[PDB]
Structures are given as C-alpha cells and as structure tokens.
C-alpha cells in the first residue's frame, strides 16, 4: 500500500502544480487590477484626509472573498470576523459577495444577507463590474440609508499578513458635515454629499476587492505553496521508503536463493 500512497501523493503534487499555474494566471490579473485600484481609492482618500471624514453611526456587515472556496486562511479569517460581527450586531445586514463569503454570510444570520451574488472573483477587478455591484448595492434596500458600513476586507501586507480588517465609510450625512469638511466646500445645487458617499463606496469597494482577489491568488500561491511543501516532504519520504523496500526485497531474494544453495 506504500506504492499507492507514493503514487497518490505524486498525483496530488501534479494537481497542486496545475493549481499553482492557475494561481499565477489569476494573480497576474488580480495584481493588474489592484495596482490602479489602490491609486483610485487613494485619490478620494486624499479628500478624506483633506477633510477628516469620520463617520458617526441598519448598518451593513461585509467581507472580502473572491469566487474561490477557501485557501488556507483566505476564507477562514473572514468567516471569523463575520461571526464576530454577527455576535456584535445580529441585526446587521450582510452583503454576501462572491461564493465563499456568500456561503459564510448565509451561515450566521439568514436575516442578514440582503444579496447573494456569486462568481465575483471571475478575473481581475473590473471597474464596470465593481461599479455595477455598488450601484445595485446603492439601490437594493437603501444601503445609502445605512448610517455606517464597515468593510471587513483583506489587508495583504506582503504575502498573507492579513485578516478581514474593518474600516469606516464616509456616507451621505458623514461627508457634508464632517468636522474638517469645512475645509473642502460643497454646493447646495451640486448635491455633493450623496455623490461623495457613492463614489467613496465605489473606490473603497474596487480597491478592497482588487486587494482581496490579489490576496486570495496569494492564498493560491501561499496556501497551496505550503501544500506543495507538504507534498514534497511526503514524496521524499515515500520515495525513500520505496527505494529501500525494493533494494531490501532484491537483497532478501539473493539471500534466500543462496541460502537455498
């Protein structure tokens, strides 16, 4: 049964290599998106720094996960934050994004998930797909009326130094009357506050989804990488056992044949 173990580990290693190639293919696009998305969000963040855009105070619960079903700690860490939010704010509506986050959000509170959209992590973060997702969110159940909304989003530092970290969003009320919003002026006719809330949600969502897709592609290159290491170690051990077993079998055969003679 050692031979079947070695060959099955070898097959798992081949499958892991194929998954690594798929990870590279998806990670190229995820990084390509995140590169521009980070700057896009920093553009409106400059305003949120130009005007201290602290939001005070029906409050949604969100998470970051692409269209894959967990990779090491890609879905688990976000699920823990989702359960913590469910405990803290049971009456908090959930935005079920992708599949793994969709399944995790459907797990805790049936009355929280207000949307169930799948396959968000199809490819790189696209501006139009993210924008349409937000516009639907900005139209579903008055998520703009949601006084506060925390984005429990991945913060991949370099490779996997992340969890679904929580951040605030400057909404329609919190944009116009920010304490340092006196710095940047708005127009009564232009209706700045609503548009600033929507666009802040847009930039934050695009940047966060791009970072999360990049981080899960990392989980497809930093969790399967650990699995590839495990397969290498198991394969070396099994190869040692089989090479020793074959040699010992041949030796015992020679010994038996001579001992017969």
């Amino acid at each position: 049964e050692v031979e079947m173990r070695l060959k099955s580990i070898k097959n798992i290693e081949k499958i892991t290599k194929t998954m690594k190639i798929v990870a590279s293919t998806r990670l190229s696009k995820a990084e390509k998106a995140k590169i521009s998305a980070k700057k896009m969000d920093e553009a409106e963040q400059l305003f949120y720094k130009n005007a201290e855009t602290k939001n005070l105070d029906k409050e949604l619960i969100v998470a970051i996960t692409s269209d894959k079903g967990l990779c090491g700690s890609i879905h688990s860490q976000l699920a823990k934050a989702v359960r913590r939010h469910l405990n803290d704010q049971p009456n908090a509506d959930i935005v079920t994004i992708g599949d793994k986050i969709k399944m995790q959000l459907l797990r805790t509170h049936p009355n929280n998930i207000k949307l169930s959209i799948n396959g968000i992590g199809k490819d790189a973060p696209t501006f139009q797909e993210s924008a349409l997702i937000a516009d639907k969110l900005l139209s579903v159940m008055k998520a703009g009326t949601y006084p506060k909304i925390s984005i429990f989003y991945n913060d991949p530092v370099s490779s996997l130094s992340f969890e679904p970290s929580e951040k605030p969003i400057f909404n329609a009320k919190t944009i116009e009357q920010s304490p340092s919003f006196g710095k940047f002026e708005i127009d009564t006719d232009a209706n700045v506050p609503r548009d600033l809330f929507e666009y802040t949600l847009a930039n934050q969502m695009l940047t966060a989804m791009a970072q999360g897709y990049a981080a899960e592609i990392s989980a497809r290159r930093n969790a399967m990488d650990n699995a590839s290491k495990n397969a290498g170690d198991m394969i070396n051990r099994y190869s040692i056992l089989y090479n020793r077993t074959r040699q010992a079998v041949i030796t015992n055969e020679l010994v038996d044949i001579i001992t017969g003679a």
């Binding site: 459907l106 207000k114 949307l115 139009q128 797909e129 349409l132 516009d135 639907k136 900005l138 609503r194």
Partner: protein, 59 residues
Amino acid sequence: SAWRKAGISYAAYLNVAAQAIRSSLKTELQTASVLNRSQTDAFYTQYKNGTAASEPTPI
C-alpha cells in the same frame, strides 16, 4: 445624464458612460479588461430574511 430620476446609482451612470466611451473607440485602445467591463458575469440574486436568493441575474 438621467441618473437623477430612475437609474440605479452614480456608479451605474458612470459605468454606462464608460461602456459608451469604449464603444466610442476601436480595438487599438480597448484592452482585455474592457471586455469584462462589458462582459460582466456578476450574477446578482438579492437574498432575503429567509435566505431567498431569488435569481442570479447578471449584474
């Protein structure tokens, strides 16, 4: 333009503008990600209190 009355949101308007502006261009400008910008496979099925994901209509 008519985002004020009966659209979806500011993102919907600017995204439709993006789709038209890309349509106001040939292949020598529109990169591959513009295809996913046009081919959006995000399937929106708003759930419910009783976990009623009605229909995953493309976003």
